[PDB]
Design an enzyme around this catalytic site. Structure first.
Site, mmCIF file in Angstrom:
data_model
loop_
_atom_site.group_PDB
_atom_site.id
_atom_site.type_symbol
_atom_site.label_atom_id
_atom_site.label_comp_id
_atom_site.label_asym_id
_atom_site.label_seq_id
_atom_site.Cartn_x
_atom_site.Cartn_y
_atom_site.Cartn_z
ATOM 1 N N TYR B 145 0.837 -1.179 0.000
ATOM 2 C CA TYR B 145 0.000 0.000 0.000
ATOM 3 C C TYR B 145 0.880 1.239 0.000
ATOM 4 O O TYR B 145 1.836 1.333 0.775
ATOM 5 C CB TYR B 145 -0.932 -0.006 1.214
ATOM 6 C CG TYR B 145 -1.902 1.148 1.230
ATOM 7 C CD1 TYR B 145 -3.019 1.152 0.393
ATOM 8 C CD2 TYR B 145 -1.695 2.245 2.070
ATOM 9 C CE1 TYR B 145 -3.910 2.214 0.400
ATOM 10 C CE2 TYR B 145 -2.577 3.305 2.082
ATOM 11 C CZ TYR B 145 -3.684 3.283 1.247
ATOM 12 O OH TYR B 145 -4.566 4.334 1.248
ATOM 13 N N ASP B 240 9.023 2.793 -0.583
ATOM 14 C CA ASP B 240 7.975 3.344 0.239
ATOM 15 C C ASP B 240 8.311 3.039 1.683
ATOM 16 O O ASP B 240 7.966 1.970 2.198
ATOM 17 C CB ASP B 240 6.613 2.774 -0.133
ATOM 18 C CG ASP B 240 5.485 3.448 0.612
ATOM 19 O OD1 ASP B 240 5.719 4.038 1.689
ATOM 20 O OD2 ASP B 240 4.348 3.388 0.125
ATOM 21 N N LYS B 268 4.811 9.495 8.670
ATOM 22 C CA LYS B 268 4.685 9.035 10.050
ATOM 23 C C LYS B 268 5.793 9.617 10.928
ATOM 24 O O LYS B 268 5.914 10.834 11.060
ATOM 25 C CB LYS B 268 4.713 7.507 10.111
ATOM 26 C CG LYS B 268 3.742 6.830 9.157
ATOM 27 C CD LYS B 268 3.493 5.384 9.557
ATOM 28 C CE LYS B 268 2.655 4.660 8.517
ATOM 29 N NZ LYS B 268 1.200 4.922 8.695
HETATM 30 C C1 LIG Z 1 4.018 2.215 3.504
HETATM 31 C C2 LIG Z 1 2.981 3.278 3.300
HETATM 32 N N1 LIG Z 1 3.037 4.092 2.186
HETATM 33 C C3 LIG Z 1 2.041 4.995 1.944
HETATM 34 C C4 LIG Z 1 1.087 5.256 2.920
HETATM 35 C C5 LIG Z 1 0.090 6.375 2.725
HETATM 36 O O1 LIG Z 1 -0.162 7.000 3.963
HETATM 37 P P1 LIG Z 1 -1.357 8.069 4.111
HETATM 38 O O2 LIG Z 1 -2.618 7.324 4.478
HETATM 39 O O3 LIG Z 1 -1.019 9.063 5.195
HETATM 40 O O4 LIG Z 1 -1.557 8.793 2.801
HETATM 41 C C6 LIG Z 1 1.053 4.485 4.076
HETATM 42 C C7 LIG Z 1 -0.021 4.718 5.113
HETATM 43 N N2 LIG Z 1 0.591 5.154 6.354
HETATM 44 C C8 LIG Z 1 2.011 3.499 4.271
HETATM 45 O O5 LIG Z 1 2.002 2.748 5.416
#
Ligand SMILES: Cc1ncc(COP(=O)(O)O)c(CN)c1O
Ligand SMILES: Cc1ncc(COP(=O)(O)O)c(CN)c1O
Lengths: 430, 430
Positions: B145, B240, B268
């Protein structure tokens, strides 16, 4: 005299850390005859750079700080929240409290979804519009900005009504193919766009008051015409009120102009200066958003307690009279700056839309992007430098309005006018 | 006994304000045999719901709260900032300070750009990858994701190596056509994907440690193989690390596994619980971002002083030993929970990747999304309810790890194990 040394030093550092030395292009000051001014604090209408220089702030973080900087209530409540927790990744009550306040104040918003930015708000709205209608095409307006979402990083194609083209490198192949761009305030080109693609037009996104090509109010019948044409073809009307929201008027631009969209994208003010955004509208449309519906949109830090609180505490302090004072402040601002401009032969035109104000360095009326582009950009570049030196922090772009706060005083306005008189005289003597 | 009445009442309110009553799907608790738990405060490893119930928090806002809730330093500095200003819409020094810290701690990041979310970070990275390379196709991994960005809301097409399909209604027409999805830890399918589309593959995006399909560490040679194949075909490697960043290890997952991507998406921890995100990497690539380059990406509230500060103050308190303690905590957690599971015949498998930990209710090793989907989801639903009742707040999803903080004590771990023993026994007696 006024020293910008620390900002010079800070920007030198910035340039080796970020693209353009900034986290957003406009902050690079590339169009204003001086380098970026680094800010460290603010109080009401006053913003202070890292050089200790005081400015009357007409940027106000680009809209959020409608109560000015560091509003006592907003700040103390923010500290209170910080004590309890920045974020929980679980539902909170403040999310409910802001949600309902947003629902109670924004006409079209019955169900809202908080996000982290205006970019997310609009991107999610476009996806919602396309998922809800099962249609592919989005109509936007030339000069309108909705965020750096790929689905929106688009331009007008070759032609009068036109399936668009990508407006940036890196945009997914043929993502713009299902997006139409017609001039702002050009209802006839909208009618033409629908004649050709109407039954596949998922939605029309518009700033009910353009604020990213300067303040450009809608023309008589423009928004209503958009409301009618969308209904006729079953398309959604998305109001991008990320800037106009809670700024144009108490009930937003949609309340101010009495035109109710199907979807509304919000941000800024609703975060009180913290990262925020939201998209909302008719319940049955919003219900299609996950987890209640098939249209996927998530955000792990969405509905952030600090942002929800700041936005809540900001909005609570706004009343109908706040906007009355905005307009009165805007009148004197417009009058004083306009007379100054006249006196020194400075080409100028003011645009007013509710409590939104802005002027262009052209004598020709600005009714769209093309006529906004007619402004003397070099004059603005020069003018800006003079204004910063006179203690007025303006948006480092001609394609921006003058952001007012509740903290702006008559003295601020007078000094701002005097600053403009001085700057215009200097320019006129050249 | 334990009462969840206020959360029941709050969620009832939530359901009439937001889609699914939440600002993010997972917060709806749809897969855990109890309704959403509303949180109001936290302190270290402890999170408190609106019912005053205490939990040992293993969600930690989904990663940001690596120092636990309301860390004294982080909170006091946040209050300090709130005093000066939430946002200025102009460059700040704290943006520089976090930027360089991120640059000094994340190996591949030489130039960074702050955004408002992980969704923006990855979306911007994908656009950067495509703009920099002049290529259209992005390779992602099944189960990974990256956010709700349209360019990423995609799935595997019909076939082994496959140009993708849209993974949600509302996604722009043929946006997924230039995106390939192969199974995680499946390097051979990556090789196949490149054989067919390699010279048009703009980049490969991957979680160097999958955390959104449960914790799924990379297999031997998987990340290095991705690094090699991308170089061979001139594609960018996008890590990511929005979750893995500053959590897997001190130098992130890319430092932990000694594999350096071209681009890194962060979030985060870097916000310390406030909305945040960032994408960075090699300078020459990042230089292509506006205003210094043609690839457009803006954010009016990006580099938010509060988020920059919280993230800065969070990171400053993290040392190599923090992660040593994470691992030791994880060992006891894994051992205690595993023995409990054995004792009560509960199918289980733990995955460890640096300081990242998580288990699945299956005895079969979880090496990808398919094997993660083999987990007893109903058992997890039940188990979760039991754990919340025992004072353990887990992610309301089997497809999530156990988030550790520096504030988690041995007593917390013991109580968490005891909670699991109790819950497993109850389940086993059924
Ligand atoms: C690995 C990763 N990349 C992208 C995202 C996108 O995060 P967000 O919901 O703040 O857009 C997340 C969600 N924390 C994530 O865990
Ligand atoms: C009207 C409008 N819509 C969308 C956006 C996107 O905002 P952001 O840069 O926070 O994504 C903006 C920028 N504030 C805006 O002014």
């Amino acid at each position: 005299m006024r020293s910008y040394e620390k900002s010079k030093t800070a920007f030198k550092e910035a340039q080796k850390l970020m693209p353009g030395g900034v986290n957003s292009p406009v902050r690079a000051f590339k169009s204003v005859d001086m380098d970026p001014i680094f800010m460290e604090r603010g109080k009401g209408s006053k913003i202070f750079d890292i050089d200790g220089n005081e400015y009357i702030d007409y940027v106000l973080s680009w809209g959020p700080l409608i109560l000015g900087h560091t509003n006592d209530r907003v700040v103390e409540s923010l500290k209170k929240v910080a004590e309890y927790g920045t974020s929980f990744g679980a539902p909170t009550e403040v999310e409910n409290e802001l949600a309902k306040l947003v629902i109670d104040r924004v006409p079209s918003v019955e169900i809202v979804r908080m996000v982290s930015s205006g970019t997310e708000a609009t991107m999610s709205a476009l996806r919602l519009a396309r998922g809800y209608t099962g249609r592919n095409k989005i109509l936007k307006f030339e000069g309108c900005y909705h965020g750096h979402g790929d689905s929106l990083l688009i331009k007008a194609g070759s032609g009068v009504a036109t399936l668009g083209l990508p407006d940036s490198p890196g945009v997914p192949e043929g993502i713009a193919k299902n997006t139409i761009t017609v001039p702002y305030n050009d209802l006839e080109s909208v009618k033409l766009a629908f004649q050709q693609f109407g039954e596949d037009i998922a939605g029309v996104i518009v700033e009910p008051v353009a604020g990213n090509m300067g303040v450009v109010p809608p023309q008589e019948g423009f928004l209503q015409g958009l409301r009618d044409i969308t209904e006729q073809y079953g398309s959604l009307l998305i109001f991008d009120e990320v800037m106009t929201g809670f700024r144009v008027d108490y009930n937003c631009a949609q309340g101010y102009f009495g035109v109710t969209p199907d979807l509304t994208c919000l941000g800024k003010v609703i975060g009180g200066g913290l990262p925020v955004g939201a998209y909302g509208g008719k319940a049955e449309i919003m219900e299609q958003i996950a987890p209640s519906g098939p249209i996927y949109q998530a955000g792990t830090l969405s509905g952030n307690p600090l942002a929800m609180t700041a936005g809540l505490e900001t909005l609570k302090q706004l009343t109908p009279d706040s906007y009355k004072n905005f307009i009165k402040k805007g009148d004197r601002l417009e009058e004083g700056i306009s007379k100054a401009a006249e006196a020194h032969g400075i080409p100028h035109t003011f645009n007013r839309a509710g409590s939104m104000i802005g002027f262009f360095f052209t004598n020709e009326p600005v009714i769209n992007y093309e006529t906004a582009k007619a402004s003397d950009l070099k004059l603005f570049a020069s003018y800006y430098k003079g204004m910063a030196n006179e203690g007025v922090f303006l948006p480092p772009s001609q394609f921006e309005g003058l952001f007012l706060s509740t903290a702006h005083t008559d003295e601020d306005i007078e000094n701002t006018i005097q600053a403009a008189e001085k700057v215009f005289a200097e320019i006129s003597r050249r």
